Amino acid sequence: GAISSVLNDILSRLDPPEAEVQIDRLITGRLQSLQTYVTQQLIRAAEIR
Amino acid sequence: DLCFTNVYADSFVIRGDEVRQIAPGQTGKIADYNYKLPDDFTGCVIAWN
Numbered sequence: 001g002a003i004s005s006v007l008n009d010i011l012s013r014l015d016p017p018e019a020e021v022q023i024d025r026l027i028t029g030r031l032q033s034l035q036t037y038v039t040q041q042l043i044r045a046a047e048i049r
Numbered sequence: 050d051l052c053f054t055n056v057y058a059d060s061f062v063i064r065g066d067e068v069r070q071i072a073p074g075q076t077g078k079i080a081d082y083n084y085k086l087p088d089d090f091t092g093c094v095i096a097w098n
């Protein structure tokens with residue numbers, strides 16, 4: 001949902017208050033990616049154990 | 050209805066077109082030189098003619 005995937009690009013274009021809006025979208029989405037990864041690793045670990 | 054501990058009032062006078070440059074995140078001949086509010090600034094801005 002962010003304008004661009006690069007962090008420095010958003011920081012180097014939008015103003016400080018506008019950038020935080022776009023940076024939060026990257027942090028939120030990337031955070032969900034880790035949750036998906038860890039969730040799958042825990043499940044797969046159960047199959048290996 | 051809601052009260053605060055310490056109240057700080059900065060009194061001054063500026064040109065008309067220089068008013069919009071005083072606000073969190075805003076830049077200009079005011080915010081970038083003499084008087085600048087922080088991006089996280091929490092307060093009230095009052096002006097009259």
